Design a protein around this motif. Structure first.
Motif: not given
Length: 113
Positions: A72-92
């Motif tokens: 919305d603020t950057g004016d990029i189409p929805q199609s350009c994104f992939a969203v994911q949630g990993y929780g506590e599964s991928r620590p740095v």
């Protein structure tokens, strides 16, 4: 190319971008606008403090909040994104330390060179 945004985007337990967040979101948007050609992957992560189910849900809601702003603020189409949630599964860093735990509470934005 991975941009790591610390959780100084949200207040404790919230998945709504706090007013101060704009400064970090805008530098992340400059990097995105350079490499928008390929997939923008927004990944959410937490530490091990709390319930793993709740933390997975919360990490996805936080990744969705960052995508919504970029879209919305950057004016990029929805199609350009992939969203994911990993929780506590991928620590740095390991969660046995407070410094480690702080490093894990982040939203990452992955771009291809």
């Amino acid at each position: 190319t991975v941009r790591l945004n610390s959780l100084a985007l949200f207040d404790a337990g919230k998945w709504t971008l706090k007013p101060g967040a704009t400064k970090w979101l805008v530098n992340a948007l400059v990097d995105i606008k350079a490499k928008a050609g390929w997939l923008i992957v927004v990944s959410g992560h937490t530490d091990n403090t709390g319930d793993p189910l709740r933390n997975q849900a919360l990490s996805l809601k936080r990744a969705e909040a960052v995508r919504d702003w970029m879209r919305d603020t950057g004016d990029i189409p929805q199609s350009c994104f992939a969203v994911q949630g990993y929780g506590e599964s991928r620590p740095v860093a390991p969660n046995d330390t407070a410094e480690g735990r702080a490093r894990n509470r982040r939203v990452e934005i992955s771009l291809v060179p």
